[PDB]
């Protein structure tokens, strides 16, 4: 019902090489051939990838810049609410990145923020025209 | 098994159930009551049993009555219906026993018995037994036929049949303990050599014979679960069908590496978009870094847009040195999928050229098995006999098996010298007419009322005929001779003056250079006294390994010697015999095979007897006249001793039941 486990035989596989008295030999170099075009296409992509790995020397780690560590705090000093104004207009929606420029803000009281001042900053027609972009 | 059940197995027979046979002699049983079914079951095992534990005395029909016990023996008649019936078609009384009741005087009727082969003679010695005239035409100057003995001083080794193939079932079994016959047990160690001379070793030779044996198997699901039996009108054989198992296990192995390096592209290539995005993001960091270092160029105090700026650039940069970590990240991750990939390979090939001559060796032994190439053999018959296997080992004869017919001999007429050139069977009788081997010129006619034919399938398939049949035989036989194979195997003995080999070792082999030679000289037997190892020359080898003389074919067997024992140990030997069975006239091969294209039913063609037509149009149809047995008619026990005699006792008892009535089946 079933051939030896290891032993691999199908009707195709079967019909495929009886056709002729060469089809063997054909269809064992149709893999010979086709696994010789994967290999050294392996090897064209192995040199490429080690040129761009060489390009990345040093990774970066001389334009890093230091962890800014601050305790959060509460209320808005006019400098902290005019920054959020320009980042509104440069970050849409973004209130992560928005609290990171702040690095004194609750991701959560940006929406706040964003419900307060937002007819007294105009952040309607600001957030409109960030979306122009 | 053992008891009156072990004697039915013993005997070929089902212990529990009645036989076809049976049915015929029987009809009134086999459709009766299953009472008396069980009833004649008994003392037909159990007169069988009778005979098995003394088959060196003929075991009279009331001697049998005396020893059964009732309510068994109280039906006479079915004891007699029953004891005649195993007496006539050979389950007892066979072989050389004993008389007790003796012969009769006055013979009747008068066989022809062509060829005193095992078969032959089988049939000769019942036939006497029954109390007909037989007479026995020989073309040998010996009674061995295929089974065939050198003797010179005290060496001897059989040129012919050489190993009983176990007693569990066998016939030869019974004899045995007639016949004084040395039976030695065959060890199976069998350590192979290669070319170079240098062991095996025990990883390959054991895992190449795990291969050979999945391979076979392969075959067999290919013909039965596949119907792949015949291609573009022909019939496959099995040498086809196991190369088509190999290149698809090459197919296979090709495959699997495709896909191996095919999954290798896959991540070199994804590895390849990651490398190009951690470029082109470093370069975007590259750039902010610059306009932050800029904009903080702008000291302070500043304005807010000023301040915007630094701000916000800083937080942009960080943020794609975020992306660009969580990307050397996955970097690693792939860097490692790849060296792992590179540490899997797959199997490189699927068998190395040191392998398929390994291999070759293990199909050089198919090949002697059925002598014959495998591109011969029916993929679907090859192997229906394999069912009715003996139990227990192989042996062989250390006193030579030739001692077997050379004892049914005795007391038998047998004209030795004598082949015969035509059988004429008619409706009112047969004539044989033979020559003088010697002197082809003295002729000779016997008349006869039946004759029994045991021409080997080699002489019967001769182009153009050695024997005539007159009138020709009919095309359904004439067809089956032709479909059939007949084989080839040849030996070589090697007598030697001191003993230079593993003399616990019966057998080893030689491994071949190429598939072509895989059967010259790859076998090697110690089964003797004296010091004699024995060679085989099997498939395509054989035949081709006639037309060369003997001290080449022995100069290749002391090379292969040397290069396994060292060119100082291995002398010349002092007598040397080669054999050439397909060029012997009175063999031509060495015994029948399952041909592509044949069939087992084949076998039962052989065997049908011949009627031939009346002589006065008009008169009714007569007797049988022509019959055969030997080695090619006995379906279940092809190509061997046991199944040879085996056809002697049914043609003994079917022409004794023709000739003398059967007055079992009332």
């Known amino acids: ?133 | 098994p053992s008891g009156v059940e072990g004697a039915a197995f013993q005997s070929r027979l089902p212990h529990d159930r009645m036989t076809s046979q049976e049915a015929a002699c029987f009809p009134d049983i086999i459709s009766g009551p299953q009472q008396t079914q069980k009833v004649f079951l008994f003392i037909r095992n159990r007169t069988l049993q009778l005979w098995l534990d003394n088959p060196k005395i003929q075991l009279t029909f009331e001697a049998t009555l005396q020893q059964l016990e009732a309510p068994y023996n109280s039906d006479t008649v079915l004891v007699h219906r029953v004891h005649s019936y195993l007496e006539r078609h050979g389950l007892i009384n066979f072989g050389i026993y004993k008389r007790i009741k003796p012969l009769p005087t006055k013979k009747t009727g008068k066989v022809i018995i062509i060829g005193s082969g095992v078969s032959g003679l089988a049939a000769a010695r019942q036939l006497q037994s029954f109390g007909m005239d037989v007479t026995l035409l020989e073309a040998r100057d010996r009674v061995g036929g295929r089974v065939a003995t050198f003797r010179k001083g005290n060496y001897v080794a059989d040129l012919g049949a050489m190993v009983v193939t176990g007693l569990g079932g066998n016939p030869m079994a019974v004899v045995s303990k007639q016949v004084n016959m040395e039976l030695a047990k065959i060890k199976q160690k069998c350590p192979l050599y290669e070319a170079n001379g240098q062991a095996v070793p025990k990883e390959k030779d054991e895992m190449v014979e795990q291969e050979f044996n999945r391979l076979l198997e392969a075959t067999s699901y290919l013909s039965h679960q596949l119907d792949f039996n015949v291609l573009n009108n022909k019939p496959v054989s099995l040498g086809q069908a196991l190369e088509v198992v190999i290149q698809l296990q090459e197919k296979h192995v090709k495959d699997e590496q495709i896909e191996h390096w095919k999954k290798i592209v896959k991540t070199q290539e994804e590895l390849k978009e990651l490398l190009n995005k951690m470029v082109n993001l470093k370069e975007k960091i590259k750039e902010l870094h610059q306009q932050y270092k800029e904009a903080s160029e702008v000291k302070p105090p500043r304005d807010i847009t000023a301040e915007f700026l630094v701000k916000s650039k800083h937080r942009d940069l960080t943020a794609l040195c975020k992306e660009y970590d969580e990307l050397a990240e996955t970097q690693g991750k792939l860097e490692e999928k790849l060296q792992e990939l590179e540490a899997n390979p797959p199997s490189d090939v699927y068998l190395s050229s040191r392998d398929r001559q390994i291999l070759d060796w293990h199909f050089a032994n198919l090949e002697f098995a059925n002598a014959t190439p495998l591109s011969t053999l029916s993929l679907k018959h090859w192997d229906q006999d394999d069912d009715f296997e003996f139990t227990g080992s192989h042996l062989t004869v250390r006193n030579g098996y030739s001692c077997v017919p050379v004892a049914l001999a005795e007391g038998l007429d047998i004209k030795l010298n004598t082949a015969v050139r035509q059988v004429r069977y008619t409706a009112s009788g047969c004539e044989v007419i033979a020559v003088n081997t010697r002197s082809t010129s003295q002729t000779f006619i016997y008349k006869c009322d039946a004759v029994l034919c045991t021409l080997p399938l080699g002489v019967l398939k001769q182009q153009p005929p050695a024997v005539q049949f007159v009138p020709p035989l009919p095309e359904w036989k004439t067809s089956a001779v032709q479909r059939m194979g007949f084989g080839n195997l040849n030996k070589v003995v090697l007598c030697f003056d001191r003993v230079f080999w593993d003399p616990s070792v019966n057998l080893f082999g030689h491994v071949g250079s190429t598939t072509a030679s895989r059967g010259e000289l790859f076998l090697f037997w110690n089964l003797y006294k004296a010091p004699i190892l024995l060679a085989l020359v099997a498939g395509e080898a054989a035949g081709i390994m006639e037309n060369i003389s003997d001290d080449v074919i022995v100069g290749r067997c002391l090379a292969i010697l040397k290069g396994i024992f060292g060119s100082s140990a291995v002398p010349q030997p002092k007598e040397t015999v080669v054999s050439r069975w397909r060029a012997d006239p009175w063999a031509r091969g060495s015994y029948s095979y399952v041909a592509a294209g044949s069939s087992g039913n084949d076998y039962d063609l052989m065997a049908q007897p011949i009627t031939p037509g009346p002589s006065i149009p008009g008169a009714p149809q007569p007797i049988p006249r022509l019959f055969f047995a030997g080695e090619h008619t006995i379906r279940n026990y092809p190509a061997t001793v046991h199944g040879a005699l085996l056809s002697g006792l049914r043609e003994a008892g079917r022409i004794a039941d023709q000739f003398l009535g059967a007055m079992y089946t009332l």
Do not use: H
């Open chain 1, 1 to 133: 019902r079933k051939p030896p486990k290891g032993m691999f035989l199908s009707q195709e596989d079967v019909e495929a090489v009886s056709a002729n008295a060469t089809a063997a030999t054909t269809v064992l170099r149709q893999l010979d051939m086709e696994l010789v075009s994967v290999k050294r296409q392996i090897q064209n992509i192995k040199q490429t990838n080690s040129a761009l790995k060489e390009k990345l020397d040093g990774g970066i780690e001389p334009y890093r810049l230091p962890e800014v560590i601050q305790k959060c705090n509460a209320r808005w000093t006019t400098e902290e609410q005019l920054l959020a104004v320009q980042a509104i207009r440069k970050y849409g929606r973004d209130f992560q990145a928005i609290s990171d420029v702040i690095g004194n803000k609750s991701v959560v009281q940006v929406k706040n923020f964003f419900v307060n001042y937002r007819r007294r900053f105009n952040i309607d027609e600001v957030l409109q025209e960030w979306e122009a972009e």
